[PDB]
Swiss-Prot record, chains A, B:
Changing residue 3 to S: Is predominantly monomeric. Retains the capacity to bind to DNA and repress transcription in vivo, even though its activity is considerably lower than that of the wild-type strain. L-isoleucine binds at residues 61, 96, 98, 100. Signal peptide: none annotated. It comes from the Bacteria. The chain holds residues 2 to 155 of 259 of the full protein. The lineage of its organism: Bacteria, Bacillati, Bacillota, Bacilli, Bacillales. This is Global transcriptional regulator CodY. The keyword Chaperone does not apply. Homodimer. Homotetramer. Homodimer under physiological conditions, but homotetramers are observed in the crystals. GTP binds at residues 51, 69. Changing residue 61 to A: Retains some ilvB repressing activity in a BCAA-containing medium. Retains the ability to respond to GTP, but responds poorly to branched-chain amino acids unless GTP is simultaneously present. Belongs to the CodY family. It comes from Bacillus subtilis (strain 168). It is found in: Cytoplasm. One of its GO terms (molecular function) is GTP binding. GO terms for cellular component: cytoplasm; protein-DNA complex.
Amino acid sequence: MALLQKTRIINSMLQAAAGKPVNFKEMAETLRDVIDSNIFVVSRRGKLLGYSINQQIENDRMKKMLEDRQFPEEYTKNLFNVPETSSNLDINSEYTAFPVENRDLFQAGLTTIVPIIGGGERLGTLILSRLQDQFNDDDLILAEYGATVVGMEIL
Amino acid sequence: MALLQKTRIINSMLQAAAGKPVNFKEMAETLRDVIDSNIFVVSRRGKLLGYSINQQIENDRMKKMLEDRQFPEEYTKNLFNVPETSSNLDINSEYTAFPVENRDLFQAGLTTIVPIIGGGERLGTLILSRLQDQFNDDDLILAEYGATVVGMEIL
Ligand SMILES: CC[C@H](C)[C@H](N)C(=O)O
Ligand SMILES: CC[C@H](C)[C@H](N)C(=O)O
């Protein structure tokens, strides 16, 4: 579908979502649907405010993080070192969203890190991940729109 | 500039604009800058919540509306008859944003009407106008993003 179709899907969601209580799961699912990627909305200290999986997780340590709604400390602290969007980070990146013990299986795994910013303040991080298919400009447009509005719906 | 550059300009504005008091003038100016059009943010009953002019107004009746921060009653009521975005409406359209007494001078004037929607509710209208250059998909993406976020910043 055109980008205009995908932005219309996000917009339709945002237009209905006010003034119901904020739903970060719904925002994560909508972004998963239009970007075709796993989506994690991560607080400054690693809390999963919302997420949506595009591919089943066959890693017990990762499935635990979802259940706990919490990402690891060191991983989470290091996200602050990325000040702007950084896309298509591969399995060997310290920022990868794939479990390092399964690097071989996820050799084609790609990760995009999108700072969520909220008032001169870093409020969290929007993480996107998927296999094989490089993120493009349209994906970034949609990811950054999501991160921006998430930053608004966070406040 | 790419669309990604223009969306980044809107995003940069929205990211800084929280949690300062809502600034509809700033949103109108930002959209004027990235869409290259006059921008009017119009309430259900015709109040100009914000606007930004791209072309000097040489029509006293129009300059009066800006000063008054108020569009005409009948014109404003009729906007409700347009339920979805309708772009590139020409000088002969009842919805034109150009003054009808200057149709000849503004023969090339084009108007885009974008409902602002806010919770199953029509909250107002975002109007874009300019001369000669047809609005395209990128312009609509930006206009609808603006209308959606304006709908959020309205609430
Ligand atoms: C969310 C943490 C991610 C999966 C990190 N690459 C790890 O293996 O711990
Ligand atoms: C804002 C109203 C507009 C300009 C309308 N076409 C009129 O002439 O009154």
